[PDB]
Every structure is written in structure tokens, then in C-alpha cells.
RNA sequence: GGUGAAAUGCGCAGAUACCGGGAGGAACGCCGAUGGCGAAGGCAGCCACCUGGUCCACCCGUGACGCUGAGGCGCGAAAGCGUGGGGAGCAAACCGGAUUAGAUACCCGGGUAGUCCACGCCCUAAACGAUGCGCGCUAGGUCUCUGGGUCUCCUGGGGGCCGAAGCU
């Protein structure tokens, strides 16, 4: 397993790990974490819960990855880290582990594990939680403009209809998902969200967005 | 050695004896640091511009050294030391640059 | 205009090194504890350069004044 | 209730509000009025006017304490000081003498930005 | 400091002949004599930086005079040397 | 108190204004300049010690010992970093008040790092005269700082302004 140290990455076994998250009461785990703002905000408001961030592409993280080992007087926590890793080879040692996971506004390969679905992977995905633990994932093309991408990896159009038919869910079932809910929001909602393409989604022009959201129940 | 002007301003309100005391101590400090006494001046009590340590007068004290300037720092450290003793200006002697003449 | 009198004509030939003068010294202070300009002390740029530091060992000394107030207004 | 007499005045002019206060023959005060003693409460408290009103305010009330005779003292520039100086002189008190007294520094503490672009 | 009685007694005790006071020699001499008080403030005062540059300096018009002796009179250079107890 | 007006805020556990006493940190009014010093960065309370550079007069001593200087070494505003100390005022971030269509700003009330000291590190800048160093030669005028002189001006070093020839 690769964590992330200032701007240089380093190993971390499941020992050290389990030795870390005994300090919390909460795990929780954002998938395709991004530029790492999510957990950022999230860590300074939730002291007791420990955020892992996963994402493959380390230098995005770097800003993040900085602040966090400052001293705690300019901005340095101690209930954050940073994963280095895709879904198709996520960590064993994070296995079985999260109290609760997001994935927000994915894209590429992973957009597409999410949408079609692929159940392999999100069965992957639903193995970094316990039994039960609460999941979101917030998506929006919403369409047209951004396509190209329809013509390309296929994909969803994709309504509130879409993600609430039954088919979507039974795949979906097959993964471990329970779909508990599902929103559609809009511009103004969004703004909530504290996050790279969250905000840039959100102050750029019209769009339907989706939150999805529920628990796991694989196990 | 360097010749100085050691200026001191002590309480003006030591009585005969008292004072006489204090100068004691100085005299005996400055040979102590190698203080050649050239010579003393003692206008002795003034009106102060401002009060020193409450009291708005103040008794002075002028003495004309030689001495080794490697102490004159001490010199005063040691002249500082009074209770009575609420000033301790050593200065290097200096030609007196005239004026309008 | 400050055309009044120049401190220093108005006065005789004093050691302007001296920091003990306090009767002569006092002659350059504004109506405060405040140093004269050359303009009212009628002194040179070296004179009224070592003016200064003569009136600050007095202001130490106790025997001349760093402020004083102002009377009227 | 005491009957003092001669006595000190410290206007406390500033260009938000002025403040008087009237004092014994060695400096603690007897009486103190302001813009805000009076009506006013916010812009109009620094006013000249208010100035005028909180000076004669001071100086009356003062007079039950027996006032007659007092020196002024002036501290700070602001909204009508002068007008201060001013009821003092006529509210019926003899004004001895008027001192400007303002505090300095001699260069000390670095003031809020507010009051710094100088130099 | 160095008083004209410290300065004229290394004058003479370098000087090439009575009333010498720029030979080479001397100058050398003086100019030691100036840098070790200086290398001495220095060995305190680390931080008084300003002095170094002055320091820079001596030793380099130094180093500079005695490289001119060696060109011209090769004994009289090891000479002041041995003597000065320069180098090291 | 504060503002365009305000509000937050502080105050009857008595604030503000006033007098006296004490503690602590930081800066050093007037003089002060159109000024001075330094290679630059930069440097202003006073005192002593230690110490660098620099000008002038006499022309007394050496006798080309000179100039520049890749690389090196050193110095290098602020912010920033490490350890420890300090912390009055100020104040990124931050917490509030107001303004606004919105205000992540400007204005107002708070406020942490920092700003201070030591030791070490960083090495940047509109680090500017946006003008590399040395030397010689080419009208003057005017003000100025500092030294010498036969001292209503001449002469040497420095700081400004105007301008010959010329350059652009
Ligand atoms: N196959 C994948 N597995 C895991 N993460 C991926 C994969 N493909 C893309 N990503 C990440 O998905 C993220 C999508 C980005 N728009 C950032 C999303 C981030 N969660 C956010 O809300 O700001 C990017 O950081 C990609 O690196
Ligand atoms: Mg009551
Ligand atoms: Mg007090
Ligand atoms: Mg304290
Ligand atoms: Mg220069
Ligand atoms: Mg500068
Ligand atoms: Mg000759
Ligand atoms: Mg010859
Ligand atoms: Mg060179
Ligand atoms: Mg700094
Ligand atoms: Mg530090
Ligand atoms: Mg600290
Ligand atoms: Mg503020
Ligand atoms: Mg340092
Ligand atoms: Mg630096
Ligand atoms: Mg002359
Ligand atoms: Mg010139
Ligand atoms: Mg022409």
C-alpha cells in the first residue's frame, strides 16, 4: 500500500494502519479523492472520524498532501491520508474497513465502472467497507454538450428515472450497493459540496445533478 | 587611558553625613577602576527639567578622569549600583568646539 | 517668515560642545522640549548637528527638558 | 456637595466625540459630560455642537459642586474642540488658561493601518 | 587600537634603513600587524561582517605586496616571511 | 467605541474621560535636510568599548608593486523554515459586524502565525540610477555636505539642479 508523504510516497503496511485508525471511532474512505479537498474539509470539521483519500494520480495531491504535515497552528491534521491507488488494484489492506465512502463527480475509467456498472470493481469498492456502511455518489454529464463522451465510452443519459429503474439497481444489488436514495439537485445545491469540479460544475452553466446514495450489503 | 567627565545625580536629600557617604563609595569605586581624579566640580543641587524617581531636584556631581577604558564600561556598572546614585552619565573629554565667535 | 532673531546672534560665544550649560542650551528649545530648526537657531549644518546631541545629553542629565506643554490654544 | 471652587477641565476632543471632564485642584474628577451624555448618539455626538453642549453640561453641573475658576486642558484634535474651549469660557466658569496637552509618541508602537501610510 | 607608539615601533623594526616608511617590508609589517587586531575583534564579533570585508581586504593588498616581493628580491621576501611569521 | 450611516464590541463584577503607582514589549518624536555613511542589501534616542571604509594638507618613504576578473568564497530587504526565548502594539489565516445583486473584498470589532532576540537555514526582489568596474580627455552656471587656503573666493573630495560641444 502507498500513502502519500509531503510531495514523496512511501509504504504502509496493515499494522501500522490498524495501529493509526484505533485512535477513531470512524473510517471513512473517498474513492477517486481527486485534489484531496474533500477529505481536507471534511478532516477539519470531523476530528473523530480518520479520511482516506484514494486516487492514482499522486501530484495532484501534493497541496494537500503539503498543508497536511505542517504543524497544527497552520493548518496540519493528523486524521488524514492520502492513497495512491486505482480501483481495478485498490489496497488488501483496506479491506473491510471503512465505516462510510463516497465517490464524487468520477470520470474515465471509473465514471464508467459506476454508471454501467461493472460489477467486479464496485464488489471491489463495497470490499473496503464494513457490513452496512453508508455510501454517495454524485454524477453529472448531464449530457449533449459533453458528448463526445456519449459516442465514446457508451453511457447513461442520464435521468433520476435512470438510476431509479430496476435494472440499475439489480446490478447494483449484484455489486452490494442498497440504494436507500435518490436526489437530483441543482446549481445552487452543489456549492455545498467543497470540491474540485463541484465548484467549477457548480458556477459554470446549468446542470442536473444526481446524488445517489444508501448502504452496503455484500456482507 | 582615555581622559573622561563622569557626571553623577544623586537623591538631594541626603543629610551631611549621607552624602558625604555615597561620595565615599565613589571615590573609592573610581580608584578601584583606575579613575586618576584630574580634578571635581559640584553645583550640587538643581531644578531638574523632570522629575527623577519622583523627586523633581537633584544633586550633582562632576568628576574629570583618566583611566584604562577597558573598565569604564565597569566603572559605571559599579557607580550605578547606589540606591542614592539615580544618574551616571561617563563621557569621553572632548575639545570645546566654540561658537559664534 | 520666522524672521524674529537668530538664537545664535542673539547670544555670545558658547562651547557648543558643552551639555552642562542648561542657562545657554535652553536658548535653542522651541516653547516645548522640542530642538529649534536651523531656521530659528541660526546655526550651521555642523553646528546644529552637534547642538543636538548636546541638548540630548542634558535631556538624559535631567537638567534640560524632551517636551513641555503648550499654553494657550 | 463638597465645594471645590478652582479646579482643572480636560477637553478630550476626537473626530468621533468630545468628552469633558471637570477636576479638583489635583486631578480627580468631580463631574464628566460627553456627546453621548447628552442626546446625540452616533455621527452627531462628535459634531461641534455636541462638543458646545457636553462643555456647558460639565461646566453646570460642576457648578453645584461649588466651581468657579478652572484651567482647561486640551487633548487630541477633533469634530469642534474649539467650540469646547469655547462653552467653557461663557458657561460662567473663569477659565485660567488653556493648555494643549496632546499626547505623543516618540515613535513607538506601530499604529493600526488605519493611521499608518505616513512616513 | 594601535597607537603611533605600537605603529612607529613596527616601522622601525622593519624599516630598510633609517627614515624607511614604505618599503615593502614595512608595509607588509604594518599591515600584519592591522589584520591580526582585526582577525583578534573578529574572533568575537562574528557577526560584525561589515569589518570582514575590511579584513578581505588588507589580506589581499598584503598577499598582493608580498607576491611583488618574491618577483623582485626572492631573499628579502622569504625573508619578511620568516620574520612577520606569515603564511601557515 | 466606531462609520457614509451603522452594527459587532466593550461598560453598573463601574467601562470611557482624569490623577498616582507598577510591570512588560516594541519603536526612537524635535534636530531631520532639498543632509550624511556603506560595495550592495541597507544604516538614524544617548553612553562606553571593539572595529571597517573615506576625504584633505605636507610631499616625506617604496618604485609599476597596476586594471579587470570565468569559476571559488563571502555578504545579501521582506516573507519564509528549524530549535529555544519573548510577545506591548500591529496583524496573513481565521471569527464576527456592515456594504452589496452577491462581498469568500474594500469599511468596522476581534485575532493566530508572524513582526522582537539568539543560533542555524533560505538567497529572492521594481536587490533601481531599471545605467558593470578602472583610467584619460571634452564650456560653464547655480545650490549644497565635508577638508585646505593667501577664506567677499580659490582649491580637493561628495550630493543636486541647469546647461557647451557632442550623443540619442
Ligand atoms: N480508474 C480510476 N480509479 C480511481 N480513480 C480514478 C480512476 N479514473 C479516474 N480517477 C480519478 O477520478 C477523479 C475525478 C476528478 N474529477 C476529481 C474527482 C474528485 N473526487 C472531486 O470530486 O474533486 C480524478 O482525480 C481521477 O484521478
Ligand atoms: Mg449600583
Ligand atoms: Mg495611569
Ligand atoms: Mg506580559
Ligand atoms: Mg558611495
Ligand atoms: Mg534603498
Ligand atoms: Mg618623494
Ligand atoms: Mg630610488
Ligand atoms: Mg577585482
Ligand atoms: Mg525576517
Ligand atoms: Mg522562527
Ligand atoms: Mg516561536
Ligand atoms: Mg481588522
Ligand atoms: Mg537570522
Ligand atoms: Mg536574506
Ligand atoms: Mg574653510
Ligand atoms: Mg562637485
Ligand atoms: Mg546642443
Redesign the interface.
Known amino acids: 500500500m502507498l500513502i502519500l508523504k509531503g510531495t514523496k510516497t512511501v509504504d504502509l503496511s496493515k499494522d501500522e494502519l490498524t495501529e493509526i485508525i484505533g485512535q477513531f471511532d470512524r473510517v471513512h474512505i473517498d474513492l477517486g479523492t481527486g485534489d484531496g479537498r474533500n477529505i481536507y474539509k471534511l478532516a477539519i470539521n470531523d476530528q473523530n472520524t480518520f479520511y482516506i483519500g484514494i486516487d492514482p494520480v499522486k501530484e495532484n495531491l501534493f497541496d494537500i498532501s503539503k498543508k497536511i504535515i505542517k504543524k497544527p497552528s497552520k493548518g496540519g491534521l493528523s486524521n488524514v491520508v492520502f492513497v495512491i491507488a486505482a480501483a481495478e488494484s485498490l489496497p488488501f489492506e483496506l479491506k473491510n474497513i471503512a465505516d462510510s465512502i463516497s465517490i464524487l463527480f468520477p470520470w474515465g475509467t471509473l465514471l464508467e465502472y459506476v454508471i454501467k456498472p461493472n460489477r467486479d470493481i464496485l464488489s471491489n469498492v463495497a470490499d473496503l467497507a464494513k457490513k452496512e456502511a453508508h455510501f454517495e455518489f454524485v454524477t453529472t454529464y448531464s449530457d449533449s454538450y459533453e458528448e463526445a463522451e456519449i459516442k465514446k465510452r457508451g453511457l447513461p443519459l442520464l435521468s433520476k428515472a435512470y438510476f431509479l429503474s430496476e435494472q440499475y439497481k439489480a446490478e447494483l444489488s449484484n455489486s452490494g450497493f442498497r440504494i436507500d436514495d435518490v436526489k437530483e439537485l441543482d446549481n445552487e445545491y452543489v456549492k455545498q459540496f467543497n470540491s474540485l469540479w463541484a465548484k467549477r460544475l457548480a458556477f459554470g452553466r446549468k446542470r442536473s445533478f444526481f446524488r445517489v446514495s444508501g448502504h452496503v450489503s455484500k456482507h | 587611558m582615555r581622559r573622561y567627565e563622569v557626571n553623577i545625580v544623586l537623591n538631594p536629600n541626603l543629610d551631611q553625613s549621607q552624602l558625604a557617604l555615597e561620595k565615599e563609595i565613589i571615590q573609592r569605586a573610581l580608584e578601584n577602576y583606575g579613575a586618576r581624579v584630574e580634578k571635581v566640580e559640584e553645583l550640587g543641587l538643581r531644578r531638574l527639567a523632570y522629575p527623577i524617581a519622583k523627586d523633581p531636584q537633584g544633586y550633582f556631581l562632576w568628576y574629570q578622569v583618566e583611566m584604562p577604558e577597558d573598565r569604564v564600561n565597569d566603572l559605571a556598572r559599579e557607580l550605578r549600583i547606589r540606591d542614592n546614585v539615580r544618574r551616571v552619565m561617563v563621557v569621553k573629554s572632548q575639545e570645546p568646539f566654540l561658537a559664534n565667535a | 517668515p520666522s524672521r524674529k532673531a537668530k538664537v545664535?546672534?542673539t547670544?555670545?560665544?558658547?562651547?557648543?560642545?558643552?551639555?552642562?550649560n542648561?542657562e545657554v542650551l535652553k536658548r535653542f528649545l522651541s516653547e516645548t522640549?522640542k530642538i529649534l530648526p536651523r531656521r530659528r537657531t541660526g546655526?550651521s549644518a555642523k553646528?546644529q548637528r552637534?547642538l543636538a546631541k548636546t541638548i540630548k545629553?542634558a535631556?538624559?542629565?535631567?537638567?534640560?527638558?524632551?517636551t513641555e506643554?503648550?499654553?494657550?490654544? | 456637595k463638597r465645594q471645590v471652587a478652582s479646579g482643572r477641565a480636560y477637553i478630550h476632543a476626537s473626530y468621533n466625540n468630545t468628552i469633558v471632564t471637570i477636576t479638583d485642584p489635583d486631578g480627580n474628577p468631580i463631574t464628566w459630560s460627553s456627546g453621548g451624555v447628552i442626546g446625540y448618539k452616533g455621527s452627531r455626538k462628535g459634531t461641534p455642537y455636541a462638543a458646545q453642549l457636553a462643555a456647558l453640561d460639565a461646566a453646570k453641573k460642576a457648578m453645584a459642586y461649588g466651581m468657579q475658576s478652572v484651567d482647561v486642558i486640551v487633548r487630541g484634535t477633533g469634530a469642534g474642540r474649539e467650540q469646547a474651549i469655547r462653552a467653557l469660557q461663557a458657561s460662567g466658569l473663569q477659565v485660567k488658561s488653556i493648555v494643549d496637552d496632546t499626547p505623543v509618541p516618540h515613535n513607538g508602537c506601530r499604529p493600526k493601518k488605519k493611521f499608518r501610510k505616513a512616513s | 587600537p594601535i597607537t603611533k607608539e605600537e605603529k612607529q615601533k613596527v616601522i622601525q623594526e622593519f624599516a630598510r634603513f633609517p627614515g624607511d616608511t614604505g618599503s615593502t617590508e614595512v608595509q607588509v609589517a604594518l599591515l600584519t600587524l592591522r589584520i591580526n587586531r582585526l582577525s583578534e575583534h573578529l574572533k568575537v564579533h562574528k557577526k560584525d561582517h561589515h569589518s570582514h570585508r575590511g579584513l578581505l581586504m588588507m589580506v589581499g593588498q598584503r598577499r598582493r605586496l608580498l607576491r611583488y616581493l618574491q618577483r623582485e628580491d626572492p631573499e628579502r621576501y622569504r625573508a619578511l616571511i620568516e620574520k612577520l611569521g606569515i603564511r601557515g
Do not use: M, Q, S
Request: without cysteine; charged residues 40%.
Open positions: 545664535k546672534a547670544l555670545g560665544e558658547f562651547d557648543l560642545r558643552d551639555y552642562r542648561v522640549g546655526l553646528e552637534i545629553r535631556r538624559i542629565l535631567g537638567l534640560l527638558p524632551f506643554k503648550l499654553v494657550r490654544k
